[PDB]
Amino acid sequence: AKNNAVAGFNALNGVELNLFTTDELKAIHYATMEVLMDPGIQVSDPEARQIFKENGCEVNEKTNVVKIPEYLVRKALQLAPSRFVLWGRDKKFNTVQECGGKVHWTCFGTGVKVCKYKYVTVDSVEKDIADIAKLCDWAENIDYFSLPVSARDIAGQGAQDVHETLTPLANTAKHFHHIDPVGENVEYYRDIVKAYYGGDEEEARKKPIFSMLLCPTSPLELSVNACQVIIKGARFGIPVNVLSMAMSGGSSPVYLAGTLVTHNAEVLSGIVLAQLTVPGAKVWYGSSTTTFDLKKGTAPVGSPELGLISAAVAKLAQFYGLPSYVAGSXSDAKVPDDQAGHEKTMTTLLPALAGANTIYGAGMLELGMTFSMEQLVIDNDIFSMVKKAMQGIPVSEETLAVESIQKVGIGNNFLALKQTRQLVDYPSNPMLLDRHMFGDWAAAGSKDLATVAHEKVEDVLKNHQVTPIDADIFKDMQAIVDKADKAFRGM
């Protein structure tokens, strides 16, 4: 009979992408350890400086410089968990974040403008965050939501950030990653999440539906805000994404290696401060770091360099045992054309094949100044093709399918096959990408991805139902937002 007993067999599941050897990784680690001693890190916050000092770091109070010794990085790393779960209001939208190659996508943040399709851009406002939340809630490849655009309208009339917390949780049931919080206001966010869970701080902590990001000030220093977000984040049990954003040639070495050393030091120092404030604190080793264009005086975020650094940060995080959050599916394009698609793919495929736990950028345009609702669903469509590609080429006796080749024989086709029938949904099947021959396409409007995309935006935003928060609970959260504006006006 046929074999049903094979011996030891080695297989590769998916597609593995390598940028480093162990020697090289260590080469970068040692370099970060030298830098953490010199020049060291400048921690502006005095509360943060004391935690460091209490734990061994030699702190210079005149200059605010902190020299984190290597054993604190180790101790910090031994403490940071290797995984944690972001929560949405709907468990189905829950999302794991763990050290490894488990990839997930989230949208870009934060734009100041919003593309509306001719194609025009109009400064964003809180209402925009509401729609994108509706659109992102529908986008299957968009695991969780990240503050997409700043509500400039609530700016100066109240706690812009607290508003930027309620509307997202409101118009979306997926985890919410706050791209731009105010340390002084973390208490509010906690209270908002707490208000959601009916005042059960235990529930809020156990099922975090709200996380937050902060950026080291490239190069080599944590601002009072960054510190407060970390410190508070750790005391309140709010997952924190310590995501630096250096720029090759600008805030860091022109070389990518050197730019990882600077990026690494910043991030670790943040992660060290989180683990010291509260061991077992949930953190992300993240990055949006890229290369500064010396010939264009701009910060291209769709270059192959961002793609590499993102993929490189993903490998670093794995090296250290932490989840990664990196830039992906990004573009410098001002309109949804060839260039957007290319850059969006270049900057997403690398960190995806590399293993980034979260890849944010979807929806972006114009180097992060604008948020295109079209590019967002296009991006979400591009991620399907990525996931396909990520399945690599499974090799088993079933997939080698010798008997099928033999059954069909020479000069026939596999269409009438049972195997072909049953696997109909396996091959890639793009929702937006057009695969029709010129005739049928042309008989549909001779439409390009952009318009086909905009037609979708309009349909989603019009027919998609988001799960609403119960009225009782909502009022309680709205209250807090109101209490926040109260104070803002008061001061």
Partner: protein, 214 residues
């Protein structure tokens, strides 16, 4: 000698060497040479040779700043003997610049500052997260032709209005032309706020600064 001290001051800048920039500024002090002569016949000479190549696309941002860093390494060497003591002024407009308060983004502001410095203007960097009050105090203390702020956020861009106000209630708003620039900053903002100039970029800012006073 003087011709040789000006030959070096120029070489110092086209070669992007801070040391020599200090050396020449030294052999310059040891000759009684008027520092203003060195800052113009000497350093700005080479300053302008770079911008020349910068315009043809031979050199890039890196060279501008690297040259500006040299001009400062020299001017430093003689800041004591210079203006501090003699109290003499240079020439070709005077622009005070810095990143608005609440904002730490500085790469751009530094590029604008250099492109001006290399254009021929005298730049006074106020740093970053510069408190609104310092802008005012530096305006009436230095009495510059142009006061420039940089804002890269929608929340720090708003503080530029305060520069306009506190400057007006200081009786100097009409003594100087203000400029605003930054990713989120636009011409509409410049108008709505009342700012004299809007810098689209470093080149646009330089072109407008001269077209506004030159």
């Amino acid at each position: 000698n003087k011709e040789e001290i000006i030959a070096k001051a120029k070489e110092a800048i086209t070669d992007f060497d801070d040391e020599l920039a200090e050396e020449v500024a030294n052999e310059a002090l040891a000759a009684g040479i008027d520092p203003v002569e060195l800052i113009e016949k000497g350093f700005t000479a080479g300053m302008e040779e770079v911008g020349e190549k910068f315009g043809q696309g031979e050199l890039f941002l890196p060279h501008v700043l690297a040259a500006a860093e040299a001009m400062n390494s020299g001017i430093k060497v003689i800041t004591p003997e210079m203006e501090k003591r003699k109290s003499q002024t240079k020439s070709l407009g005077t622009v005070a610049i810095g990143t608005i308060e609440g904002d730490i983004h500085s790469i751009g502001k530094d590029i604008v500052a250099s492109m001006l410095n290399i254009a021929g203007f005298k730049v006074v960097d106020l740093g970053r997260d510069v408190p609104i009050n310092t802008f005012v105090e530096k305006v009436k203390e230095l009495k510059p032709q142009v006061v420039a702020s940089s804002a890269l956020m929608t929340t720090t861009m708003v503080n530029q209005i305060q520069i306009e106000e506190q400057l007006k209630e200081a009786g100097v708003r009409d003594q100087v032309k203000t400029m605003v620039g930054g990713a989120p900053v636009t011409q509409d903002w410049a108008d709505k706020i009342g700012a004299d100039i809007y810098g689209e970029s470093a080149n646009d800012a330089v072109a407008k600064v001269k077209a506004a006073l030159n």
